[PDB]
Structures are given as C-alpha cells and as structure tokens.
C-alpha cells in the first residue's frame, strides 16, 4: 500500500556475471555488500550484490540472478539490507535455490 | 569565434570551486560544471537558458542523425540557435570525445540547477493522456 | 613395477610443473602489462580547440 522502491542508478555496463552501476543522483548512498534490485521487466526482479563502491559513484555488483535479462538501460533499486534468506523448520523438506526460491519438481530470515 | 571570457574560464581551474552540492561521477561531472561556472558568471544566473539548449538540442539531433559528434558545432546552422558557451562546451567534449556522455552531462547540470534555485523535480508517466480527477489524486 | 611407479610420479611432476610454468609466465605478462595499464592518466588534459 505504502511500499515504495529506492533507485541508486542506471546500468552502465555488464560483463559475465559482474556489472557495474553508475548514480542516478549525486547525494545518494548504496551500504557495503547490500543486495540491489535491478529492473528487468515490469515484473521481474533480478538480485545483485555489492563489492565495491568507488569515488565516482560508481558500484561494482556481482550479478547473482537472471543475468541473461539484465540490461544496460535498466534501473537498480537498493533494498537497503544485507543479503538475507528465509529459515526455520518450514523450509525443511523443500529443495531451494541460494537466495530462498523454491525449485518446484515432479518470516524468519537470516 | 569563442567568447573571450568564455576561454577565460575554460583557461582557468574550476573544478577546485565552490558549487551548490557536491557532485560524483567521473569526467562527465566536469563538462557540468563548465556548464554552471558560464551561468553563473556572465550570463548571471540565468540557468535556465542552458537547460533549454538541452530540449533544443534533443531535437537538432533527431534532424541531424546519430553522427552529428562529426559536424562542427560552432559553424553549424541547425546549431546556431543554440547559446555560445553551450557550443563551447559541445567543441570541448567533441575534443575529448565525450559526446557519448551528454545525458549524463544533463542529468549532472539538472541537479545543480535544481540546488542552485533550490528545487526538485519529479517525474510522472501517464499512459496516453493525463487526467485531471487523477492528476488530482495524484 | 617399481620403475612404472617411478615413472608415473615423475610425469604427474613433469606436467605439474609444466602446466605452472605456464600459468606463471601468463599471470608475469598480465602482470606487466596491468601495471603499464595503471600507468595511464584519468586526466581530461584539456586544449584549445580554436
């Protein structure tokens, strides 16, 4: 209702999996080894995390998820977080991915 | 053809001067700051001028192709329109090869027009035609 | 017996150190040739163009 999503900048280049953002804005700040959005579609959602963050503005991002649709021209939103997944006894019997998607087959986050 | 003033400044180091806010990026960031020394010193804050060669330049383009880094600014007729120290600014970045990096150069001179005046812009997209009921809600 | 045990140990040494020589000389020229790419200026080194 309320949600609202924070943009850091803009792809400016790729490469494999690493990419890197430039600011859409002077003045704005991206923490350390925070886990960024990227805007594939109008639905999709990648998810990408930081390494390193220059004096230009500039941010390097290893590209964890769908790299195959990222783009150059494509926004980047901070989810302002740590790289978090969710835990408990409920994700036992489900094989999952890394960040916590469940591959489907034939609250808590830490 | 150059203004004299206009090579004064370019001359001189600007990028050690006091600005609005502070600004991050690369070399871009430079071409900017050219842009807001010339407005605020001859042309006496009149920012806006320049921001309007920005909208009139979009549209020379459109008229002129993908290359026109090639054509000479300074003695161009679809150019002529367009104020003297944005051409100055043009021929420095066609020297340098940076005419790949003016909508970064625009979002750069947007942001210090914005804090010089004090202003912030915000963007909204319609899907044909606004509506005012909506605009309203807006 | 004793003698292809030998000889087998000596090839996995041989190309051991063949396979890290190579390695070596390649991360020697990368090396180099990175330091010279260090050695290039972000400078704008601005002229008169008129």
Known sequence: ?110 | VPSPKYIEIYQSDFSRNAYPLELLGGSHVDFAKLLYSFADQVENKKFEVYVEDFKKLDSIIAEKGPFWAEEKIFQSPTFQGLSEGFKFILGWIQSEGAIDRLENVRLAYKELVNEARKETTATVIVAKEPSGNDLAEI | ?50
């Open chain 1, 1 to 110: 209702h309320l949600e609202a999503k924070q943009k850091i900048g803009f792809v400016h280049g790729i490469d494999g999996t690493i990419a890197t953002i430039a600011p859409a804005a002077s003045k704005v700040t991206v923490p350390y080894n925070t886990v960024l959005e990227i805007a594939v579609s109008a639905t999709n959602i990648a998810n990408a995390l930081v390494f390193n963050l220059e004096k230009d503005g500039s941010i390097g991002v290893i590209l964890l998820d769908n790299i195959s649709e990222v783009r150059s021209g494509q926004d980047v939103y901070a989810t302002g977080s740590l790289l978090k997944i969710p835990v408990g006894f409920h994700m036992l019997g489900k094989i999952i991915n890394p960040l916590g998607k469940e591959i489907p087959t034939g609250t808590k986050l830490g």
């Open chain 3, 1 to 50: 017996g004793n003698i292809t045990g030998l000889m087998q140990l000596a090839d996995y040494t041989y190309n051991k150190t063949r396979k890290e020589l190579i390695t070596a000389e390649l991360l020697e020229i990368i090396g180099t040739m990175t330091a010279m790419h260090a050695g290039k200026k972000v400078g704008l080194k601005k002229t008169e163009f008129w």
